[PDB]
Amino acid sequence: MNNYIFVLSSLFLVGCLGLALKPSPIYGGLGLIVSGFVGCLMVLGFGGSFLGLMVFLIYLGGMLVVFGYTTAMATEEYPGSNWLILGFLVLGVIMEVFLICVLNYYDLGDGLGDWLMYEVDDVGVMLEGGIGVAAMYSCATWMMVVAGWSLFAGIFIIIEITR
């Protein structure tokens, strides 16, 4: 539809509300994995195939998975029934509708119109994300170096903490 993004945006807020009610450590991981799926989709909507898939590849299964992993190792003591949380969550599901509603009557609005892909070359190539992300190696080679040191000194920071 035209509200291709809004609906999704709404789902992203629902997942964030789930993480915010701080549900059981791994039941909510799912929540993230859900909104990460959702955010992966929105970016794709705007044409960021690479940037999008990237999230589905790194935060989704790399970061998040490792997160729950550790949950299992510790902090998954799985000792308030999440169902109570789901009860509240349901409240917010529509409570947010309230927040939107005021501005809904106030109304941009009426779903989502041309509030996406503002300008795109009706002709032409090389217009695609991943050409921009690959500026790490031409004209933006300082972001690349500092990220390196993050991960690189990350190794040394982690082991030192672990030890």
Partner: protein, 344 residues
């Protein structure tokens, strides 16, 4: 620490503030802040004592959420101006976020709860770095953006800090926390003049660094985290009793010593700008800070507390000396006042 790791970490703890200061693309300023967060956490848990893990886990959560808030400000700006950096046009709320966030990393005012607690569980050494080479980074970001921040908020965080710092300090007896509290206070003065004359913030900082760095290397010379512990200074090492006395009164604003200049010129600049309401209240409770400074003076110098018999044993053995920095930073700090005009 495998000396290699020591190098990588220390480099990061030092590349962290330096990238922040040098770059203009805010993003690069954010990652400078991010590195500092990552580099400091390993050192904080070096003893790995149960208190330490608590310290780092607090420092990290407080630092991390603030880092995320600073990033949100940069992300929002990017959509209100394509630029990756704050400009005259910036929405006021965008800047206020940056003030709150950066005032959390620096630990000013109503966000002053983490610092006293992390200063209590970390070693005296890493205490210094956590107090003085980690304040340079955020302050740089603020000083750069001063023209745009709000005069009202800063002042409120300034005044609050002064009060919280002072009041907190009065009760504390642990030295690490007395210093943590002082830093909150001095940090307050610094952020008070930022909107008006940033150049004075950089003086009220250096002087704080030239005052606190000698003070802590003094606390650790005898590694005393208690006033009772520093009070037996007269037996362990008598000479530092004289300068410890002046440096602490210098940390508070008493007039002959170097410490008056930062307060004096900040008050002169605020009165020049007409805040004779705000400046007056700050100076007054600033006087509360000296009370707890002098109470320590009493215990350590003006009165001689009783010592244990084993203290004679520690005297016998040659006392490992205090680095030269102590002297050069004790004198340049206790008495440079005759040279104020050129400092400002």
């Amino acid at each position: 620490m495998n000396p290699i790791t020591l190098a990588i970490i220390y480099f990061t703890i030092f590349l962290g503030p330096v990238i922040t200061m040098s770059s203009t693309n805010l993003m690069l300023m954010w990652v400078g802040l991010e590195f500092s967060l990552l580099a400091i956490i390993p050192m904080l848990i070096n003893k790995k004592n149960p208190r330490s893990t608590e310290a780092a886990t607090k420092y990290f959560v407080t630092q991390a959420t603030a880092s995320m808030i600073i990033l949100l400000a940069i992300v929002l700006n990017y959509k209100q101006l394509g630029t990756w950096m704050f400009q005259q046009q910036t929405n006021g709320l965008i800047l206020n976020m940056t003030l709150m966030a950066l005032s959390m990393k620096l630990g000013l005012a109503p966000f002053h709860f983490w610092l006293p607690e992390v200063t209590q569980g970390i070693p005296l050494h890493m205490g210094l770095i956590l107090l003085t080479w980690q304040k340079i980074a955020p302050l740089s970001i603020l000083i750069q953006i001063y023209p745009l921040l709000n005069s009202t908020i800063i002042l409120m965080l300034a005044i609050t800090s002064i009060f919280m710092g002072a009041w907190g300090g009065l009760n504390q007896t642990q030295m690490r926390k007395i210093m943590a509290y002082s830093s909150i206070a001095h940090m307050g003065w610094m952020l008070a003049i930022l909107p008006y004359n940033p150049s004075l913030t950089l003086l009220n900082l250096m002087i704080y660094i030239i005052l606190t760095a000698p003070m802590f290397m003094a606390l650790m010379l005898n590694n005393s985290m208690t006033i009772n512990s520093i009070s037996l200074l007269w037996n362990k090492t008598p000479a530092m009793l004289t300068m410890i006395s002046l440096m602490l009164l210098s940390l508070g604003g008493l007039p002959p010593l170097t410490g008056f200049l930062p307060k004096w010129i900040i008050i002169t600049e605020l009165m020049k700008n007409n805040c004779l309401i705000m400046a007056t209240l700050m100076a007054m409770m600033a006087l509360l800070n000296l009370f707890f400074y002098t109470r320590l003076i009493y215990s350590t110098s003006l009165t001689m507390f009783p010592t244990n018999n084993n203290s004679k044993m520690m005297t016998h053995q040659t006392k490992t000396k205090p680095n030269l920095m102590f002297s050069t930073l004790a004198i340049m700090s206790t008495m440079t006042l005759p040279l104020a005009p050129q400092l400002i």
